[model samples]
Target chain A: MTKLILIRHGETEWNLLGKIQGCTDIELTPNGIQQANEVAQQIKGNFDIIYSSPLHRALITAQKIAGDKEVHLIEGMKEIPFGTWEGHTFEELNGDINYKKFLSGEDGCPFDSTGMSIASWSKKNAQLLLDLCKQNENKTIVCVSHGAWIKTSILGLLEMEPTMYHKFQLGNTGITTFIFRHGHPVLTSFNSTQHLL
Target chain B: MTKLILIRHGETEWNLLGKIQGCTDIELTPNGIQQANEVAQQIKGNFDIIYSSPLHRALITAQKIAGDKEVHLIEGMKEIPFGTWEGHTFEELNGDINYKKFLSGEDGCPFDSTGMSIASWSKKNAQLLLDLCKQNENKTIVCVSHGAWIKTSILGLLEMEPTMYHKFQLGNTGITTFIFRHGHPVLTSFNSTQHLL
Candidate 1:
């Protein structure tokens, strides 16, 4: 069995201001760095290897947790893009009919606000993380990425549509664990931000 | 007839860094402010009204150009989100297989890296701007937004697929004109940034 622990990047200035980042590369705030350290303390040096998104925010978080392990940068682990809605906040989008449709998770809302279809994104990025687990079977691996990336990838693993994207919420440095046995994944724990408390 | 002169927001800090802003609310730089003033000088009191994306960067740019005119905030005019790739540059994504495929305009690349599909976005946002034009028929309106929003909306008006997204480019404060006659649009000019020169 491969123990796959997915960790979200620490908070960023944009995250604090409630701005949508998508693929934008804002650095982590000072508090974000502290959160990474808290998560690192929670792990207590249990994972064997660390894989991270190429974005600096995720990479920095992974570094805080890795200790002695080298953090490998993976493009597949990056956050899902938000497309045209990138910088705006939920408040700003509250009046937009399309945004309302999206938030309502209404059927046929066509969750494509990030400039890409959710279906295609899950298939590519989510599959890549799963494949990584299979390749490192029986080992413990730590993967760090953004909030949207971790959520969509997990959904992909569960054979669910990306339409359920909003149902999963990951706090900064939140850790989600999946235990893979015989190349199949079982969700053991998800979105654990207890350390921050 | 409605003369719609579309102008991109002034240069932002992200623009100078070659970073993707996509929905990230980065403010315009000093040079960007200067650029907006230059565009205002070029207009020479031609526009009747101003409509701008609610994002600060575009709003500030519109303010510079609008002078005493009230700049109406339009939610639909926001920039395309870059998703998780926000902040990173093209050079950073150069080695990303998916990004490369997207750049190549490959059929399966799934441009949703920004989190939304371009096909759907162009359709929705483009229509919104068009409807705005129809609402203000026979008047000359100044519409300010990000490069992607302007580019994609124009492509939508031209009845092209979102796959052609990269083919058009707009510099900071660059102007593109569309003359709408009886609710039909005719492109007059595109990406005219000569004012800064």
Candidate 2:
């Protein structure tokens, strides 16, 4: 079984303020930096390799977790593009019907200029994860990415529809574990932060 | 839309020790009590009703979170029956091939005396949850259940098969939210513990 430890990057200024940081390269906040350090101590086992998104928030967290190890950047694991809705909070877009539908687990993201549906985005991200898992059979690997991308892509991998979009939550620096056997990812743990506690 | 909050009971002694709980009525540790209290502070909004498994572990956690609210017991929300393996740790069963397969996310639990498949159990539990959501339309409700039951049942509700068994994790007292509209359950937020943070 290929073990994959999926971690969301530490908190950013945008994360604290409830803003969407989709594909935006925001640096980690002081608290976010502390969170990354805490997570580094919490994670168990040795990783054969480390992978991270090119985004600064994710990169910093990955670096903190990896110590002196090298972090191979994977562009495919980056946060989902929020398009026009970037930097906006849900409360700010509460009146937008399409946005409301999206929040309610409907399939489309009307505010995205990229014209990428949630289904398509999740499918692409899921494929990237599956390919990575397949390539590193029987090895332990770590990937640091963003919240929405991790949640949606994981649900996609489980063959869940886009309507199951908000079904999982990933806290800042939260750790999720999966074991891939025969190219199928089996979730071993989700959204755990007891180390912080 | 009916807002449904799903919470797993906090850590029991078995949980901390990595024992298979499987309907074993273990009480919570002091940390579990603390988690329940912390979750109560973290959960927003007023719950119209609180539902809980009859098991003491879940009932105590629900009561702590419910505050002055009433808790209605639901037998169907109890933990999956681990049968003969109820109190055994994974380490003790290391050489058991059947246990390993179950851990690897294959269908049936070899230790279960009920002879029921995981798919059947998940479907039954999913129906119980869905029926509760449908009965309490437009209301904000809380259901405190077991980890394995909640995870598999939610996946089953999403139309996933038993192979998706290990696809999600529900931490002790981890909160998941859903919005029910026209008998359809839409995932709103999952495995959230920002309150504990």
Candidate 3:
């Protein structure tokens, strides 16, 4: 079986204020940095390789987790582009029907230049993950990415519609795992943050 | 926020042999007992309540986790009535198309007298969990149940179509957590086994 371990980046200033980080690159907060360090210290299991999105928040977390090892960049794994709403909070957008529609991730919802459709973004990540898993058969890989991207992509892989993005809460620096046998994958773990606790 | 932590019962003879434990009140093996002990020792956070299905495997595991704390029984939390398929293994079911369809959990799939459609079963679990959460607002609850039931019920809570039951795997004694605020729930943790690691 091919094992894939995914870790979302640490918290950010935007994360603290409940702002959307989306495609906008933001550095990790002190708490975020500490979160990464704690996970690096406590995460179990060994991985043969490490990778991260080019975004700074994810990169820093990946570096801390890799220690003396190298961390590669995979552009396809970056967070989704959230156009005009990049800095908006869910609470702020609670009344914006357009934004809510985008969040709902309805399959028929037209793509917004303001932000990519959840269905489309998750599709990409799921494909990227599956291709990565197939290419690295019998190996274990650790990847650092963002929260929504990780969760939605997982939903995509599960063949679930991406509308439930808001339901699965993945705290900053949470670790998720998947195992693949042949081409079939199973979610071995999901959004684990006991290290934070 | 109310916190709900779900733990799958430990390994059984059926589990080790790849047999389905659905509705079977099998006892846990020595390794299963060890798993329960380890989870109880290492699980982080505190809970105000504990619950279990009446099944021996789940009851025993819940008792171990609860210690002096009472582990109340929730009849609604019992494993799916898998009817005639209760003791079969996935490996053995590879050739059964009807079984595969039931596992796929298609929304319109007809209910099986032999077992249950994944969609229908998950609906029950999701409702049970929501009602339980509503009755105990702002409290933390820990429950022990079976694997498929836990994963599917979670999919139910997420409002996912539940066709992806085979995609998520819950190890024995693995801990999955959720947090609810104002009746909105988020999966804080999923199928965590780091403590076992």
Candidate 4:
């Protein structure tokens, strides 16, 4: 049995500003720092191995929780790419014709830079994430990932309905626990961060 | 030669609260999100590969910036672990007698849950970062990382005096660029993000 804990990174300046920072790297605010510090105090499990997305936000949180424990970085843990729409404001992207088409399902992403649709991209990496989880069974591990990545992964792992995707919104420093017992993964916790509260 | 750009994640809610959140996985504030958006606008470079600290704050920025590009998450990029001092504010930690001694002297870290010194851990990690930089020379790469780790890394890679470490203060979403040629790294730019204005 493996216990998997996924934590979303703390809030960012842009998150507060209502921008879609698809692939632009940003820093944490002072308040986000506090939440992370508090969360380090909240986690209760004894993790054997710590794995996290290479993003600093997740790494920062993972490092806090890992303490002196050795950390394993996973390349597959990064968020879905936003392509040409990386830094464009919601209004800007929505105003573009091709973007509109992409959003409205008239076409796939025309921008070579924009990431693949949720279904397509999720299919590409979901198995890899699951394999890591499966290989690490019988141990407690922490896998810190981004918002959309975690959402897409959970749906694929549990074989849940895609319509329920947005139903899961993660709070900064929120902790989601996936328990694997007898080779079956169970969603024991989702977006719980009472540690900061 | 890989051109690696290291940008700290944007400010978070705790940053607003004036907390020293070392190695805690936290989210970005609204402002942080905006910072990330601005970063995307500032550096429109075509990144071949993106690596981020596993910390939540750094990953958020990396996730936002990688846009639709494929990203590789690296655990070696994680912030230095704070161990037992994970949740305590700097003020609170300073109030402790032993903590003050530990901070001021070379007795190593007393609060580290992993019993490792920050300087030692950062030095080791900095070597790993340099290795990554060397391997990816002449290519444009963006490393999303924490303040401490990133600061130490720049110093190590540039072969700057260790005493000059704290002299480099980076703002949220600040962009630091270095070019490596002939196995030696050169600082083309250091912590420039004028676009935020």
Candidate 5:
């Protein structure tokens, strides 16, 4: 069995302020750094390999968990490119029709300004996780990435509908886990913030 | 918003022995009591109320968590009735075709000797959770229940297909969480055993 552990980056100024960080590159707040540090402490003795988004927030989170271990930065772990939605607040997104529809995440609503449906995004993110599972067979691995990517990837892996992207909630530094046996993914846990508790 | 926290009963002799406890009224082992105690320590300050299965294992786990707080025992929180499959070992069940078919949990496989489809079970269990949500709206509540019931209820609440029932895992004393806002449930966490870490 291949055990895959997924973590979201710690809090950002954007995260606390309700702004969209997307692919614009944001750094962690002090609380964010502390969050990842606690996570690293909890999972310190576990995991065989680490992979991370090239973004500073995610990479640093992975580094915190991996400590001195090698963390491979990969394109597959990057956050979704939110296009025009980057650096916006909740009210800002709520004000516009396109943004409103996108936030609703209905059947035809787009995921980003790219007009890509949530289904397409789900398929895209899911493949990234599947590829990694194939590459790291029989090992416990960690991937630190953004919330949207992590949620869609899990939805895809479970073969659930695209709209489920909005149905699950995740907080910073929360751990989601899956075990792949016979090349099939089974969710062992989701959004576990018990360390924070 | 209403927050619902789910916990499985700790290890029973049946659990350690791989016997199908399935409403057999098994008691917790010493370590099982320890598991529930640690879980209680972690979540001691959080929840507003407690609910539990009528069975000793689940009720005792809830009692440990609730301390002097009252634990309301309910039929909705009970384990699934496995009928003749109760008290059998895994290998013993595997030797029979009907048991093998039920274990497969695929589209034509049965869930129990009752010939109930997984879909039907999923729906039935899901309604139990929904009923609690409506009854306890705006409150944070805990439900200490059995494995099969919790898993199927979550699948039902998420509107996931019954065949996906085996695609998630939960160990003794693990926490699964959901939040309901505007009368709609959103999964916040699943199978969290971070307290054990």
Candidate 6:
């Protein structure tokens, strides 16, 4: 059985600034690189397969953890596609009424203001997360992702409504653990950032 | 019978850059403004109802052509939704071989690229265009639209392939005359820029 472990990349300058990282290729900050090393050491090199988002942040994080293992980049794991709101901080978007309505998730934005919503990504993006879980039910695997994505990926697999996605706070470099047995995922840890602390 | 005259708006800054305009809001260029003026002069007066793409370029063109006509903004008339390719210039995307394939009319894009295919938009937007043509065939009507949209609008009426869309070059503010008789559109002219000349 293959084991899958999903890890969001360390915080970038944008994340530290409370800016939306959706689709914008933000690089890891100096602290972010340090966090990657810490997380890599904390994992103690457990897992056969390492997966990362194509985005530089997740890719860098995955590479740090892989160490001697081969890291595979998957495009599906890329950050939620933020259409018009890319690169801009949340504060900037707050002033725009259309963005405000979108943040409320009220279906106001004509495009997918938030990367293909949790519901849609559950099928396209999250499916791979599940496949890895089921394929390697008893193995340890690592999936390096992003903030909005980690929360959505967890909630989607948990069968929770997308509207409640905001309830989970996924800090940059935080690690959430999920154990799978007999094709079902069981949450073993939620947002454990002890290493960062 | 209501006549639906679908006129593509003039060029935009992005259009000159060959960027995918999907849902991106950009204003018309000075030449684009002039193109709209020429089209307005070419097919002026006698329009009872007007429709426009919710996008700025099309809306501006429609407003210019409608003159005193009551104009309606329709979301369905909007351009195809670009997933990850919005706002980036064509030159930036040329690095990817798949994008290159898409440019050459070969299928080399993401699988969901079909969602943004000209054929699909043509089919969907054509329904509204054809419906308007049927409902008000006797009254002259005008639709402010995009180049690919107008091309596809004609293709749907002609039942042509989407990949062949590139073959239908729509010069900025180019007007194609399509006469609908007995509720069927008959192509009278193809991309005639004589007015601009």
> Distance from true position, residue B172, model 5, in Å?
0.4
Query: Candidate 6: interface RMSD in Å?
Result: 28.7
Instruction: By lDDT, rank the candidates, best first.
Output: 5, 3, 2, 1, 6, 4
- What are the models' TM-scores? 0.48, 0.65, 0.90, 0.46, 0.93, 0.46
lDDT of 4 by residue, B102-187 (tens): 54445433334556554555467658867887787667888888776777776566544343333455668877666655565655
In model 2, the runs with Cα more than 4 Å from the true position are: A94-111, B1-74, B79-148, B156-163, B166-197
Estimate candidate 6's alpha-carbon lDDT, on a 0 to 1 scale. 0.69
- Candidate 5 is graded, for docking, as high
- Using DockQ as the yardstick, the better of models 1 and 3 is 3
Error of 4 at A149 (Å): 49
| Stronger candidate by DockQ (1 vs 2) | 2
Clashes of 4: 95
Q: Tell me the tens digit of each residue's lDDT in model 1 across B86-187.
A: 889867887676677665556423443644556667777778878887788788999999887887787677555555565454678878777654465655
- Candidate 4 lDDT by residue in tens digits, A9-118: 77778767766555566766887777777776666446788888777777776777777787689888876777776666667766677665544444332332364655
User: How does model 4 score by TM-score?
Assistant: 0.46
lDDT for B175 (candidate 6)? 56
Worst 10 residues of 2 chain B by lDDT: B105-114
Docking class of 1: incorrect
lDDT of each: 0.76, 0.78, 0.81, 0.67, 0.84, 0.69
* Interface residue Cα RMSD of candidate 4 after superposition: 21.7
Q: What TM-score does chain A reach in every model?
A: 0.89, 0.92, 0.92, 0.83, 0.93, 0.87
Candidate 4, B-chain TM: 0.84
**Number of the top-ranking candidate, with lDDT as the measure:** 5
Candidate number that wins on DockQ, 3 or 5? 5
| Correct interface contacts retained, every candidate | 0.00, 0.37, 0.85, 0.00, 0.92, 0.00
Please report, as a residue range, the 10-residue window in candidate 1 chain B with the lowest summed lDDT: B107-116
Instruction: Please tell me the interface RMSD, in Å, for model 3.
Output: 1.2
